[PDB]
Amino acid sequence: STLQLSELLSLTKAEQSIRLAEINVELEMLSAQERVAWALQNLEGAHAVSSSFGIQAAVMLHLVSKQQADIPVILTDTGYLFPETYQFIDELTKSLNLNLKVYRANESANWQEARYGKLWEQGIEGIEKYNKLNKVEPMRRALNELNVKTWFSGLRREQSQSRAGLPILSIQNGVFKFLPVVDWSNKDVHYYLKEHGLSYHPLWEQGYLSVGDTHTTQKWEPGM
């Protein structure tokens, strides 16, 4: 019927890889659409997709919302996303009719600066505290409050050497981690966006290879 997470959580990471070995080979042979369908039918709920609403965010949001219209979309608002990212979040929430769930620190950006100064300018300890306060704790709380057991993410092996071996299905932070486009190339992403009339993030046209916080995103070109 539905694969139970509690049995896999009592196994070591190695035992989990063995238990999910056959399924992973079977999922590789399916399309991203068949993989999401398989996850919605066979993995324990609740199901949720997270998105930073970056350059290629419309692919995962369209892919999963077309199979579960009311699937929760987890956004962790750091309070420092680019203005164009906030505009893109509003545009896709309306165009794809997304069930947007917003999570953030208990303290606003101005409260954090009043208490700590600018954490991103205070070395290793500053960046670590900033990430825990504005990315890690809000995501951990979202998974808990939304009762998530299956977590959809748009990670792809082609994004970096460190992600070259990512499996479609694994266990991370107590939930099933499902990556339906893990084997997609940058070309596959472009084809999908054009195929469904979806847009890239507005700053892609302005030379941003990626987007995050206004204070930490790399200065991709001179003049930035």
Short mmCIF file of C-alpha atoms in Angstrom, two decimals:
data_model
loop_
_atom_site.label_atom_id
_atom_site.label_comp_id
_atom_site.label_asym_id
_atom_site.label_seq_id
_atom_site.Cartn_x
_atom_site.Cartn_y
_atom_site.Cartn_z
CA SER A 1 0.00 0.00 0.00
CA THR A 2 2.16 2.93 1.35
CA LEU A 3 5.86 2.56 2.41
CA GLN A 4 6.27 3.23 6.19
CA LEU A 5 8.98 5.76 7.23
CA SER A 6 9.16 4.49 10.88
CA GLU A 7 10.70 1.12 9.81
CA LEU A 8 13.44 2.88 7.71
CA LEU A 9 14.20 5.40 10.54
CA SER A 10 15.26 2.45 12.78
CA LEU A 11 17.88 1.42 10.13
CA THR A 12 21.44 2.76 9.62
CA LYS A 13 22.18 4.98 6.56
CA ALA A 14 23.88 1.95 4.88
CA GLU A 15 20.82 -0.33 5.57
CA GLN A 16 18.52 2.43 4.17
CA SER A 17 20.55 2.51 0.89
CA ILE A 18 20.25 -1.34 0.58
CA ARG A 19 16.47 -1.30 1.38
CA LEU A 20 15.86 1.48 -1.25
CA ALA A 21 18.37 0.13 -3.86
CA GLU A 22 15.89 -1.74 -6.17
CA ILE A 23 13.18 1.03 -6.04
CA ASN A 24 15.83 3.67 -6.93
CA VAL A 25 16.81 1.65 -10.06
CA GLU A 26 13.07 1.34 -10.97
CA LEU A 27 12.43 5.11 -10.43
CA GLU A 28 15.46 6.05 -12.65
CA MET A 29 13.64 4.36 -15.61
CA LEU A 30 10.48 6.51 -15.03
CA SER A 31 9.85 10.13 -16.15
CA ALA A 32 9.80 12.99 -13.61
CA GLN A 33 5.95 12.94 -13.91
CA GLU A 34 5.78 9.16 -13.20
CA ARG A 35 8.26 9.57 -10.27
CA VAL A 36 6.10 12.29 -8.59
CA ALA A 37 2.96 10.15 -9.20
CA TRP A 38 4.75 7.14 -7.62
CA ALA A 39 5.75 9.26 -4.56
CA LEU A 40 2.20 10.65 -4.04
CA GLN A 41 0.74 7.06 -4.20
CA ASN A 42 3.44 5.07 -2.33
CA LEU A 43 5.21 7.33 0.22
CA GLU A 44 3.57 8.36 3.53
CA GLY A 45 2.07 11.89 3.79
CA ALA A 46 1.94 14.69 4.21
CA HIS A 47 3.72 15.62 0.95
CA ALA A 48 5.32 19.07 0.50
CA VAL A 49 7.65 20.79 -2.00
CA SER A 50 10.17 23.43 -0.86
CA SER A 51 11.32 26.26 -3.15
CA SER A 52 13.70 29.25 -2.86
CA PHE A 53 11.96 30.68 -6.00
CA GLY A 54 15.37 30.92 -7.72
CA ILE A 55 16.28 30.88 -11.45
CA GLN A 56 14.68 27.50 -12.41
CA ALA A 57 12.04 27.29 -9.61
CA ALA A 58 9.00 27.15 -12.00
CA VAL A 59 9.95 23.58 -13.11
CA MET A 60 9.42 21.84 -9.71
CA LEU A 61 6.43 24.06 -8.81
CA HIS A 62 4.62 23.28 -12.12
CA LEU A 63 5.64 19.56 -12.10
CA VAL A 64 4.30 18.82 -8.58
CA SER A 65 1.29 21.24 -8.44
CA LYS A 66 -0.07 19.71 -11.71
CA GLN A 67 -0.30 16.33 -9.84
CA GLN A 68 -1.45 17.70 -6.42
CA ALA A 69 -3.03 21.17 -6.85
CA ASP A 70 -3.09 21.96 -3.07
CA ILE A 71 0.38 20.58 -2.24
CA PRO A 72 2.02 22.78 0.42
CA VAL A 73 4.87 24.93 -1.04
CA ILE A 74 7.35 25.73 1.79
CA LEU A 75 9.10 29.12 1.47
CA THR A 76 11.62 30.22 4.13
CA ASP A 77 11.68 34.04 3.85
CA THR A 78 15.12 35.17 5.10
CA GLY A 79 13.76 38.78 4.92
CA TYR A 80 16.56 39.62 2.43
CA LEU A 81 15.45 38.01 -0.89
CA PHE A 82 15.85 40.19 -4.01
CA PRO A 83 12.84 42.42 -4.79
CA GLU A 84 12.59 40.46 -8.11
CA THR A 85 12.39 37.19 -6.08
CA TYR A 86 9.44 38.51 -4.00
CA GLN A 87 7.78 39.61 -7.31
CA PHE A 88 8.46 36.10 -8.79
CA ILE A 89 6.97 34.39 -5.65
CA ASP A 90 3.78 36.53 -6.08
CA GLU A 91 3.68 35.85 -9.89
CA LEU A 92 4.02 32.03 -9.62
CA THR A 93 1.72 31.80 -6.54
CA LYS A 94 -1.00 33.40 -8.73
CA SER A 95 -0.19 31.75 -12.12
CA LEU A 96 0.19 28.18 -10.68
CA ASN A 97 -2.42 28.75 -7.88
CA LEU A 98 0.13 27.57 -5.25
CA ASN A 99 -0.64 26.64 -1.61
CA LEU A 100 2.22 28.90 -0.33
CA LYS A 101 3.32 28.28 3.31
CA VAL A 102 5.72 31.03 4.52
CA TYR A 103 8.17 30.42 7.44
CA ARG A 104 10.71 32.85 8.95
CA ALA A 105 12.54 33.73 12.19
CA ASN A 106 10.52 35.03 15.20
CA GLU A 107 12.56 38.27 14.83
CA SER A 108 12.35 40.48 11.68
CA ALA A 109 15.43 41.57 9.65
CA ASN A 110 15.52 44.98 11.46
CA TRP A 111 15.15 43.26 14.92
CA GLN A 112 18.07 40.86 14.03
CA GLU A 113 20.28 43.83 12.93
CA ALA A 114 19.34 45.76 16.14
CA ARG A 115 20.31 42.71 18.29
CA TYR A 116 23.39 41.32 16.42
CA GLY A 117 24.49 43.84 13.77
CA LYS A 118 24.91 42.40 10.22
CA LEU A 119 25.59 38.67 10.89
CA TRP A 120 26.77 38.03 7.26
CA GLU A 121 29.66 40.52 7.90
CA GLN A 122 30.85 38.73 11.10
CA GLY A 123 32.80 35.71 9.72
CA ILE A 124 32.14 31.95 10.18
CA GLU A 125 30.14 32.32 13.45
CA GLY A 126 28.01 35.20 11.98
CA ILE A 127 27.13 33.28 8.74
CA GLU A 128 26.41 30.10 10.78
CA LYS A 129 24.04 31.93 13.20
CA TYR A 130 22.36 33.75 10.24
CA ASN A 131 21.77 30.42 8.38
CA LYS A 132 20.38 28.68 11.54
CA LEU A 133 18.06 31.63 12.36
CA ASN A 134 16.77 32.38 8.79
CA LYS A 135 17.03 29.05 6.85
CA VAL A 136 17.51 25.88 9.03
CA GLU A 137 15.14 26.50 11.99
CA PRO A 138 12.26 27.86 9.81
CA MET A 139 12.50 24.79 7.49
CA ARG A 140 12.68 22.33 10.45
CA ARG A 141 9.57 24.04 11.98
CA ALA A 142 7.70 23.99 8.62
CA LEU A 143 8.27 20.20 8.20
CA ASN A 144 7.05 19.64 11.81
CA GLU A 145 3.93 21.91 11.64
CA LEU A 146 2.89 20.69 8.15
CA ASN A 147 3.31 17.00 9.29
CA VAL A 148 5.59 16.33 6.28
CA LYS A 149 6.88 12.74 5.73
CA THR A 150 7.69 13.19 1.99
CA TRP A 151 9.78 16.20 0.91
CA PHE A 152 10.05 17.05 -2.81
CA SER A 153 13.13 19.08 -3.89
CA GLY A 154 14.47 20.25 -7.31
CA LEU A 155 18.13 19.26 -6.60
CA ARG A 156 19.95 17.98 -9.74
CA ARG A 157 23.18 15.90 -10.07
CA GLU A 158 24.42 18.36 -12.78
CA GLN A 159 24.42 21.27 -10.22
CA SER A 160 27.79 20.23 -8.65
CA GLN A 161 30.42 17.45 -8.18
CA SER A 162 29.07 17.05 -4.59
CA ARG A 163 25.56 16.15 -5.98
CA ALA A 164 26.81 13.84 -8.82
CA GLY A 165 25.53 10.68 -6.99
CA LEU A 166 22.24 11.99 -5.45
CA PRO A 167 19.58 9.22 -5.43
CA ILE A 168 15.93 9.94 -6.39
CA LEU A 169 14.77 8.51 -3.01
CA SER A 170 16.61 8.64 0.34
CA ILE A 171 15.95 9.58 4.01
CA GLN A 172 17.15 12.98 5.34
CA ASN A 173 16.20 14.82 8.59
CA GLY A 174 13.56 12.15 9.41
CA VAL A 175 11.61 12.39 6.11
CA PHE A 176 11.66 10.83 2.63
CA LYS A 177 13.76 13.15 0.37
CA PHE A 178 12.38 12.76 -3.21
CA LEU A 179 14.22 14.37 -6.18
CA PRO A 180 12.07 13.79 -9.29
CA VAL A 181 14.30 15.80 -11.74
CA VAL A 182 17.65 14.66 -10.19
CA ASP A 183 18.90 13.36 -13.62
CA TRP A 184 17.72 16.44 -15.64
CA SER A 185 20.27 18.57 -17.56
CA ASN A 186 20.14 22.39 -17.86
CA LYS A 187 18.83 21.77 -21.44
CA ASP A 188 15.97 19.55 -20.08
CA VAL A 189 14.99 22.41 -17.68
CA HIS A 190 14.96 25.00 -20.53
CA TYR A 191 12.86 22.69 -22.78
CA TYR A 192 10.31 22.13 -19.95
CA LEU A 193 9.94 25.89 -19.19
CA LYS A 194 9.35 26.72 -22.91
CA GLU A 195 7.07 23.62 -23.34
CA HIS A 196 4.69 24.80 -20.56
CA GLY A 197 5.10 28.59 -21.21
CA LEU A 198 6.87 29.05 -17.81
CA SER A 199 9.36 31.85 -17.06
CA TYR A 200 12.86 31.93 -15.58
CA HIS A 201 13.36 34.23 -12.52
CA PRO A 202 13.34 37.89 -13.77
CA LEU A 203 17.07 38.42 -12.91
CA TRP A 204 18.21 35.57 -15.25
CA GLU A 205 17.86 38.07 -18.16
CA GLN A 206 19.96 40.57 -16.11
CA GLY A 207 23.02 38.23 -15.84
CA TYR A 208 22.30 36.60 -12.43
CA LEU A 209 23.41 32.92 -12.69
CA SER A 210 21.73 32.36 -9.29
CA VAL A 211 19.89 34.42 -6.66
CA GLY A 212 19.73 34.33 -2.86
CA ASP A 213 20.00 37.12 -0.29
CA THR A 214 20.78 40.65 -1.56
CA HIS A 215 23.76 40.79 0.87
CA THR A 216 25.35 37.39 0.00
CA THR A 217 24.59 36.57 -3.69
CA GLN A 218 27.84 36.68 -5.79
CA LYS A 219 28.42 39.81 -7.99
CA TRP A 220 28.11 37.84 -11.31
CA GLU A 221 29.09 40.86 -13.52
CA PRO A 222 30.93 44.22 -13.27
CA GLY A 223 28.57 47.03 -12.07
CA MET A 224 26.80 44.71 -9.55
#
